[PDB]
Design a protein around this ligand. Structure first.
Ligand SMILES: CCNC(=O)CN1C[C@@H](C)OC[C@@H]1C
Length: 152
């Protein structure tokens, strides 16, 4: 069958929203009212991969864009990028591993671990207007916890 997808927004546990802030750039900032309506709308696809009760493999595409969050080595480090794909082939159930996040539910929050890079997480900074990034630590200054909002 097709791949199943849900539209959603994410907010970090400090309640910062995500917005595309330039060519293939995602930043996190405090938003409310008119400024929130520009927040990134993910198409979260439920993809092939190792699965458990609280650990669900997903891809995070941008709604109606041929753009996916992906995890790749850059200058020899696991990094988060926005990667373009052939819009005739995506989304698909068997997404390449760089596009796969383990969505992990712990204490009413979500973490997104890279499937490709174990123990590397979608992260935000405490400061406003900084990039969303792949972070290799938790319980530091970096935020690795999120909430999801379902969108029509
Ligand atoms: C051409 C639109 N570019 C944008 O940055 C604005 N949108 C991006 C989209 C993935 O999520 C909703 C948000 C309003």
């Amino acid at each position: 069958a097709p791949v199943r997808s849900l539209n959603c927004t994410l907010r970090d546990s400090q309640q910062k929203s995500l917005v595309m802030s330039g060519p293939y750039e995602l930043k996190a900032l405090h938003l409310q009212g008119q400024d929130m309506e520009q927040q990134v709308v993910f198409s979260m696809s439920f993809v092939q991969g190792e699965e458990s009760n609280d650990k669900i493999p997903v891809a995070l595409g941008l709604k109606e864009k041929n753009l996916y969050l992906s995890c790749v080595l850059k200058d020899d480090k696991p990094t988060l990028q926005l990667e373009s794909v052939d819009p005739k082939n995506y989304p698909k159930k068997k997404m390449e591993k760089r596009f796969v996040f383990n969505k992990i539910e712990i204490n009413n929050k979500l973490e997104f671990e890279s499937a490709q890079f174990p123990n590397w997480y979608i992260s935000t900074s405490q400061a406003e207007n900084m990039p969303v990034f792949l972070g290799g630590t938790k319980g530091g200054q970096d935020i690795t916890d999120f909430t999801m909002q379902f969108v029509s």
